[PDB]
Design a protein around this ligand. Structure first.
Ligand SMILES: [Zn+2]
Ligand SMILES: [Zn+2]
Ligand SMILES: [Zn+2]
Lengths: 54, 107, 1462, 50
């Protein structure tokens, strides 16, 4: 009944800008990431993740 | 072996210890609408002969109780109708290793 | 300690007893009768606490032993008690039996028939026959009959026991374990349950009067009720042939009852078959004496010049004061004549008795347990008692035993040096002077020792003191040269005294380089945090000096944080460190087997330039550096004369390059006899950086020479399958240990030549880079506005000034959710922006390029930082984020006073277009300050402690079974493989192992091994089984032929060649299948030769026996948790809390159980989506459009109109039939509706018409019903109440109801949700757990793939095994989300551990409770509670656990004990 | 630049032996806590822990 968008589909879920990242799992060249300097990584292809504190 | 539909009188439940050595069983219809022995988390189970048993102890030089225990109320145990003191072959599939044998003692 | 003082005697076990006043009197050295402390001369007041009998006091000498204060061990006497005192600890168990017995027959009020059977079953379990205890109750056939059966009990018991004593299943000591310990707890507890459940005496039918105790130990005896006196007297003929009960009174009662009941309680309080054959006595309960510790422990105290009496000595006084006054009050009792005592005079003496008793009974508590004691004068604090002394802080076990102050150690700051050896440590001379070692005088070292003696104390290396054979200690400190000189001449002089002729003098020398020490850094989260290291005194620096690569081990940043030197005093301890925990053996992560050490920073920063194609060198250069690092004066000579490479380029001019160096490096470090490595790998750099057509990303070694690739952390850093990992694998660590150690020295040398630096120029773009950087940032203008219009569902071109637009925003601003919803949308778009500036400008737009650009080179080479840093500091910081949100808005609708309300700009929402280089606007700046404040607030073990404690006894035995110290089996094979975690790595690396085979052949050396091995049966048997599995391949698990067992199961792998995990077996075959081409291209190495060989490695890879994995498993888990301190943003509980639920709680109901539902493939998404709604839970409050109620006033009436939505809609939405909607209200809603209104009031002081008729009938206040039977749009009806009734608020009462409505709920099922098809898996996610209900949905869903977090219910429904499997899965998923790898072996170990009872066991008091091992239960929580039950059962502790070993300071049982000296 | 005063006492402390506790016959106020003790166990080094 509301006039605005309260709902979410799958593709809008892209989180953070993308940077060129070699996926240590699938060898993808792109992984999304977030920070804490603790740097997350998330594969674009297989969705594989890892984090980097260093 | 008997199949009740749902309910049993608790006094009839005391006709359960009626007639050793022979044993008596009454099971739930609904509970049996699904096989537990087929589930991707359910390992296989096989009862053991006493000689196998006496060897295995001798083989590991172990007491009865030193072994891994399984409780008798287990539906699985109930599913094989196993008496206390019995031990059963157990096949676990390791993810690292392959099929991995093991054992538990009916308690 | 002195090893010249050997002790043959040995302490095997400890037993428990209660000290009886009798022996106490026998073993007392004195009684202390006087509350007075000391005379004015300070001498002990006679009959006072400090008497010299208990020991010497000050300069006085002991009365008892006559000894000085030095040699007097002390002595302790007693204090006689005029009144028996309830022992406050026992007071509960003691009070328990009081109610149970019948005061008349002096038996327990239950029939002795039942009393006989337990003791039989008890008797069975002292010898440990568990199922036999089930055989007993199986026998059943008037007092006559009661005799034959209970007699027939005994014969069967002894028969089975004699049968059990025939063989060795149990011996005269009985048999006791955990499953043994189980029922002993269960019965006796439930046995005691029946003690309080028996109303009338089954023996005499009499009624004994009730008793009422206090916490202060005062038991008041409640009088008999008349109906008891009624029945007592009626039975009073049948036996023919609220007031304090005194301590003495209660005693004499059970004295009979004990004489009565001895036979049964004989088994109750004896943990084991009692060979001593002692009889239970009530004396051990009460306290008729008080023993006072020796004066020395009770000596007074002080903070300084002000001296303070010992507090317990005060608690000693009040007992002596209260006693003498009572002992004097008793003097009036006997003088009071029984013919002078009137009937009321009995009460004043009773007023004296109860008075006297409470005080002296309160002193018992106040002395022992102040919690059991009455407070004093409302203040002054409770004086610490002995009970309060035990649990102090962590408890005396934990505070002063489980940890201790120690000697021979120091604490100081550390500082980096590359120059030492990584296994070494820098030593300032200050410590060198102090720390010494008990040098045994020998033949070989004689001259040396003389020198330190000559050196004496203060000349390094010094000799501080000397012990002769007599033990006489000689301090050279005040001793001159010639004084020492003659002594030096005297050191080797023979032994005059006989008893010392087998003894020699010993020396204390300053530490020298040959020595090793032990380091630790607190806190210690894993074993590597403590290591031993070689020693070099460093002249003139005042602090310890450490090498870099060691830092990661101790995880030290050189913050100035201080660590701990440790200097073992004997060679064994010295030996243990050197060859085990020292350095090398630790090289891999116990968890993951991953490289834990390596070069850091500048080192990595260096390698790039050296490996450059621009590296060129003169012979002079070339030679120096080579020798510069190597130092053949080390022990590291492979070849005495230094061996070198020729220059790459002879003419016109001689030249070397950087690569050749590393080869030369390998050249003289590597064993000459053995060939060099061949290795294929890569680096972290793309070849394109260097130019067009470089291969340098690939790394290649051949003949142990460097033919391609630049060095990297991916190589000589910590990385799996790096050269360093490789050389560790191939040659062994000691090589690699040197190998790493060389590099730093070399690189350091190299730095000193060309050095390195950063620059301002480094951070400049070219002109176009900025020109670019403008362009994308320019387009960003209207981004925000567009994001709004879509969310608002407005046209994209809607100008930001539209009121409706502005209105909806304010509307949106009101919602929490919609706000967060807005952000992510905005979040998404701007992210893409960001992904453009950086992608274009770095590296292509930089003024300096790699490799000259040091800022890039550091990040690129992963030396430090990532593209993120440089990118954000050069391209821009992009949009800020706060916990997955934008900046919270002031309720004004303004982000910030610089912004008008409801602005569309992302910058207005925290989108940072600046870069640290070009500076940031204040608004921008003020934002980032918030983001900074995050982690701080965010930054603002106890778990793991629990784990380790319970897991101490975990160890490997030789049989490869995993055992506790009691030998209980856990895992038949360790990991189902038994492969060590460390060696595990290269097993699956075949191609590497294919190469190097000859060298690989060198290391393993199959030659000598043949004598000890069967080469056949496994292989024969294996291939046999292989066929079956091949034959049986595709059938499901329960169909699998059980004929042939895993080869490992039939064969000790250590004993037999070929006993193998089939996966490994299979992979090998899969490998050998396609890789056969290599054996052609090979050197002639035969697949057979290869197949056979690899098997060896596998069998070489077996874990050692006696390894304690539990600790290794313990640290493996608790330690990495620290990094989970933060979290990102299903939605289950995460981090430690989710963990704690699993391990800590073993929670029955977790907050968020989720059934995992896979479905059949044939079903479409719609149908499931449809189906999802079906099983989903519905509520009335959901479907209600609006409610309108009307009240009027002949009576107080209420007309109630409800408006719903369009029938189809929710009928589509929530899958609703108006009939239910009708029926639901038609039944449950109404019944609820008039219901509360009554309480509310009470608080104040055609067919429709027929359908309308029934409800009105069943329910009082309904005068009308109506509903919309077509559109369903509304329901409406009328109610009425008494006219006089004052106003009620209808809306809210009704408001409450519909939210409590249940239009259609599911059996323990709440919401189902369809997630995304991860990993090609098609599943539904739910909350709540019911298997049965789901078992009907099978058309949509396969059953066998259903999983849940509910594991208890799984255990409930499916039993233990499957449940265990889930346990692992979940726990993994934790670290999985955190991307943290852990050996499943740890997990399975943890898994199989909690399942050993087939039940689901946390780690806590409960999980620990079952421990046969006691002291471990003691030091854990409560020193007293467990302590009680121990003496109650009179347990002998077998000294299995390390904890106990520590308690007595004893050797590992276990750790070395698996090994035996001969 | 600027020079912090000590927030920490850089002073080391070193004891081979010395005066001991009267209660426990132990070194009076280095303390080796539980987890410290716990490490040797994973190493399996008994006589060190002894
Ligand atoms: Zn990935
Ligand atoms: Zn003495
Ligand atoms: Zn009685």
């Amino acid at each position: 009944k509301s006039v605005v968008k309260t709902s979410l589909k799958k593709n809008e879920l892209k989180d953070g800008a993308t940077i060129k990242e070699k996926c240590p799992q699938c060898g993808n060249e792109e992984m999304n990431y977030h920070t804490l300097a603790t740097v997350f990584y998330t594969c674009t292809s297989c969705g594989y993740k890892f984090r980097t504190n260093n | 072996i008997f199949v009740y539909q749902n309910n049993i009188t608790p006094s009839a439940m005391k006709l359960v210890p009626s007639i050793p050595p022979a044993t008596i069983e009454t099971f739930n219809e609904a509970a049996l609408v699904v096989n537990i022995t087929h589930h991707e988390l359910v390992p296989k189970h096989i009862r053991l002969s006493s000689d196998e048993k006496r060897e295995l102890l001798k083989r590991y030089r172990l007491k009865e109780s030193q072994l891994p225990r399984i409780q008798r109320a287990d539906p699985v145990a109930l599913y094989l109708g196993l008496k206390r003191g019995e031990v059963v072959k157990i096949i676990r599939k390791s993810e690292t290793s392959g099929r991995y044998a093991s054992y538990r003692i009916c308690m | 300690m002195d090893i010249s003082k050997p002790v043959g005697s040995e302490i095997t076990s400890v037993d428990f007893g209660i000290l009886t006043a009798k022996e106490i009197r026998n073993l007392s050295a004195k009684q202390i009768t006087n509350p007075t402390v000391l005379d004015n001369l300070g001498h002990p007041v006679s009959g006072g606490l400090y008497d010299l009998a208990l020991g010497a006091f000050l300069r006085n000498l002991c009365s008892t032993c006559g000894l000085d204060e030095k040699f007097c061990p002390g002595h302790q006497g007693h204090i006689e008690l005029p009144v028996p005192c309830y022992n406050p600890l026992f007071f509960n168990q003691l009070y328990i039996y009081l109610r149970a017995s019948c005061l008349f027959c002096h038996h327990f009020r239950l029939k002795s028939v039942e009393v006989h059977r337990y003791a039989c079953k008890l008797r069975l379990l002292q010898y440990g026959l568990i199922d036999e205890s089930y055989k007993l109750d199986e026998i059943t056939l008037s007092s006559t009959l009661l005799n034959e059966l209970k007699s027939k009990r005994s014969e069967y018991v002894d028969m089975a026991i004699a049968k059990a004593l025939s063989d060795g299943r149990t011996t005269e000591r009985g048999s006791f374990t955990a499953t043994v310990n189980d029922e002993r707890k269960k019965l006796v507890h439930e046995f005691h349950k029946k003690l309080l459940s028996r109303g009338k005496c089954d023996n005499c039918g009499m009624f004994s009067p009730k008793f009422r105790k206090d916490g202060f130990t005062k038991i008041f005896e409640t009088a008999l009720n008349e109906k008891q006196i009624t029945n007592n007297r009626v039975k009073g003929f049948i036996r023919q042939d609220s007031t304090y009960i005194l301590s003495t009174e209660v005693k004499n009662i059970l004295d009979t009852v004990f004489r009565k009941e001895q036979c049964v309680l004989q088994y109750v309080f004896h943990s084991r078959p009692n060979l001593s054959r002692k009889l239970v006595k009530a004396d051990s309960f009460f306290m008729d004496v008080l023993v006072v510790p020796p004066t020395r422990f009770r000596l007074p105290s002080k903070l300084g010049e002000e001296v303070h009496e010992n507090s317990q000595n005060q608690l000693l006084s009040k007992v002596l004061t209260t006693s003498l006054l009572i002992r004097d009050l008793n003097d009036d009792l006997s003088k009071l004549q029984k013919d002078k005592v009137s009937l009321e005079d009995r009460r004043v003496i009773f007023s004296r008795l109860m008075n006297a008793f409470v005080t002296i009974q309160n002193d018992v508590n106040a002395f022992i347990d102040s919690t059991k004691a009455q407070g004093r004068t409302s203040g002054k604090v409770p004086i610490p008692g002995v009970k309060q002394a035990l649990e102090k802080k962590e408890g005396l076990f934990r505070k002063h035993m489980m940890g201790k102050r120690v000697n021979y150690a120091a604490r100081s700051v550390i500082s980096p040096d590359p120059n030492i050896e990584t296994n070494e440590i820098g030593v300032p001379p200050v410590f060198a002077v102090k720390l010494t070692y008990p040098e045994p005088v020998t033949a070989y070292n004689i001259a040396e020792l003389r020198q330190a003696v000559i050196n004496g104390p203060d000349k390094w290396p010094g000799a501080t003191q000397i012990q002769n054979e007599d033990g006489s200690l000689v301090s050279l400190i005040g001793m001159s040269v010639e004084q020492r000189k003659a002594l030096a001449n005297q050191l080797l002089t023979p032994s005059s005294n006989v008893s010392t002729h087998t003894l020699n003098k010993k020396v204390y020398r300053h530490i020298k380089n040959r020595d090793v020490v032990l380091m630790n850094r607190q806190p210690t989260l894993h074993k590597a945090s403590m290591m031993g290291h070689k020693v070099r005194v460093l002249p003139n620096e005042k602090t310890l000096r450490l090498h870099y690569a060691n830092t990661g081990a101790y995880n030290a940043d050189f913050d100035g944080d201080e660590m701990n030197m440790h200097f073992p005093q004997n060679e064994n301890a010295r030996a243990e460190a050197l060859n085990l925990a020292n350095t090398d053996s630790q090289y891999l992560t116990p968890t993951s087997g991953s490289p834990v050490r390596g070069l850091i920073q500048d080192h990595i920063s260096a390698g790039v330039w050296l490996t450059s194609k621009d590296s060129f060198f003169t012979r002079e250069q070339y030679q120096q550096y080579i020798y510069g690092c190597i130092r053949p004066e080390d022990g590291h000579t492979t070849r005495s004369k230094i061996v070198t490479l020729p220059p790459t380029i002879f003419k016109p001019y001689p030249l070397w390059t950087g690569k050749q160096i590393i080869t030369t490096v390998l050249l003289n470090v590597t064993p000459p006899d053995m060939p060099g490595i061949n290795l294929i790998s890569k680096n972290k750099i793309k070849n394109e950086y260097w130019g067009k057509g470089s291969l340098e990303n690939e790394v290649l070694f051949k003949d142990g020479a460097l033919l391609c690739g630049i060095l990297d952390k991916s190589q000589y850093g910590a990385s799996k399958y790096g050269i360093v990992h490789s050389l560790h694998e191939v040659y062994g660590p000691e090589v690699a240990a040197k190998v790493l150690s060389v590099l730093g020295r070399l690189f350091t040398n190299y730095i000193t030549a060309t050095a390195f630096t950063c620059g301002m120029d480094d951070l400049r773009l070219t002109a176009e880079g900025n020109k670019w950087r403008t362009d994308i940032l320019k387009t960003s203008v209207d981004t925000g506005r567009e994001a709004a219009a879509e969310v608002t569902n407005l046209d994209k071109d809607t100008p930001a000034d539209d009121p409706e637009l502005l209105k909806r925003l304010q509307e949106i601003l009101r919602d929490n959710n919609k706000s967060g919803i807005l952000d992510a949308v905005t979040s998404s778009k701007v992210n893409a922006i960001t992904s453009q500036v950086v992608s274009k400008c770095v590296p292509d737009g930089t003024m300096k390029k790699f490799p000259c650009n040091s800022m890039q080179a550091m990040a690129l080479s992963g030396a430090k930082g990532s593209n993120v840093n440089v990118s954000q500091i050069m391209c821009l910081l992009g949009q800020q984020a706060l916990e997955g949100r934008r900046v919270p808005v002031m309720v004004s609708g303004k982000t910030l006073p610089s912004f008008k309300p409801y602005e569309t700009d992302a910058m207005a929402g925290g989108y940072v277009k600046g870069r640290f280089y070009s500076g940031i606007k204040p608004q921008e700046y003020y934002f980032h300050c918030m983001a900074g404040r995050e982690g701080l607030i965010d930054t603002a073990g106890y778990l793991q402690r629990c784990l380790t404690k319970q897991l101490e006894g975990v160890h490997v035995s030789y049989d490869n079974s995993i055992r506790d110290a009691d030998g209980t089996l856990v895992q038949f094979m360790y990991g189902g493989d038994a492969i060590d975690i460390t060696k595990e790595s290269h097993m699956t690396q075949f191609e590497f192992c294919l190469d190097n085979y000859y060298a690989l052949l060198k290391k393993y050396n199959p030659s000598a091994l043949i004598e000890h091995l069967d080469v056949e049966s496994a292989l024969k048997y294996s291939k046999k089984t292989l066929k079956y599995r091949k034959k049986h391949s595709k059938e499901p698990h329960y169909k699998q032929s059980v004929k042939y067992d895993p080869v490992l199961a039939k064969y000790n792998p250590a004993k037999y060649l070929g006993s193998v995990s089939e996966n490994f077996q299979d992979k090998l075959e899969s490998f050998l299948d396609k890789n056969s081409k290599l054996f052609k291209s090979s050197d002639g190495v035969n697949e057979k030769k290869f197949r056979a060989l690899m098997q060896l490695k596998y069998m070489r890879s077996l874990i050692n026996p006696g390894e304690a994995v539990g600790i290794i498993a313990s640290q493996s888990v608790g330690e990495p948790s620290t990094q989970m301190t933060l979290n990102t943003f299903a939605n289950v509980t995460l981090g430690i809390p989710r963990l704690r639920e699993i391990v800590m709680t073993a929670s029955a109901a977790i907050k968020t159980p989720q059934m995992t539902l896979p479905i059949w493939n044939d079903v479409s998404d719609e149908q499931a989506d449809t189906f999802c709604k079906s099983i989903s839970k519905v509520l009335l409050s959901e479907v209600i459009d609006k409610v309108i109620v009307t009240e009027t006033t002949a009576a107080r009436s209420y007309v109630i109109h409800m408006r719903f939505f369009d029938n189809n809609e929710y009928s589509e939405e929530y899958d609703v039939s108006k009939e239910e909607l009708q029926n639901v209200i038609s039944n449950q809603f109404i019944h609820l509706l008039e219901a509360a209104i009554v309480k509310e009031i009470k608080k104040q002081k055609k067919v429709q018409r027929d359908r309308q008729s029934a409800i009105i009938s069943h329910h009082r206040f309904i005068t009308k019903y109506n509903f919309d039977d077509e559109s369903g749009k509304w329901c409406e009806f009328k109610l009425e109440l008494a006219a006089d009734t004052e106003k009620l608020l209808m809306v809210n009462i009704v408001e409450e109801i519909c939210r409590k409505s249940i239009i259609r709920q599911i059996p323990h099922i709440d919401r189902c949700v369809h997630p995304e098809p991860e990993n090609g898996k098609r599943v539904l996610v739910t909350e709540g757990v019911n298997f049965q209900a789901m078992w009907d949905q099978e058309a949509f869903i396969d059953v066998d793939g259903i999983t849940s977090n509910d594991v208890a219910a799984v255990l409930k429904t499916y039993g233990v095994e499957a449940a265990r499997n889930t346990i692992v899965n979940e726990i993994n998923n934790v670290f999985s989300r955190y991307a943290i790898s852990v050996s499943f072996r740890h997990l399975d170990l943890i898994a199989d551990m909690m399942t050993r009872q087939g039940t689901y066991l946390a780690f806590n008091r409960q999980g620990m409770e079952t421990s046969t091992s006691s002291f471990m239960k003691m030091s854990y929580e409560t020193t007293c509670q467990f302590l009680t039950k121990a003496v109650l059962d009179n347990e002998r502790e077998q000294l299995d656990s390390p904890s106990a070993r520590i308690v007595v300071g004893k050797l590992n049982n276990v750790g070395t004990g698996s090994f035996d000296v001969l | 630049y600027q020079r912090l005063r000590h927030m920490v006492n850089d002073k080391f402390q070193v004891r081979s032996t010395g005066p001991v506790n009267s209660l426990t016959m132990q070194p009076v106020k280095i303390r080796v806590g539980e987890m410290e003790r716990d490490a040797l166990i994973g190493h399996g080094t008994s006589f060190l822990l002894q």
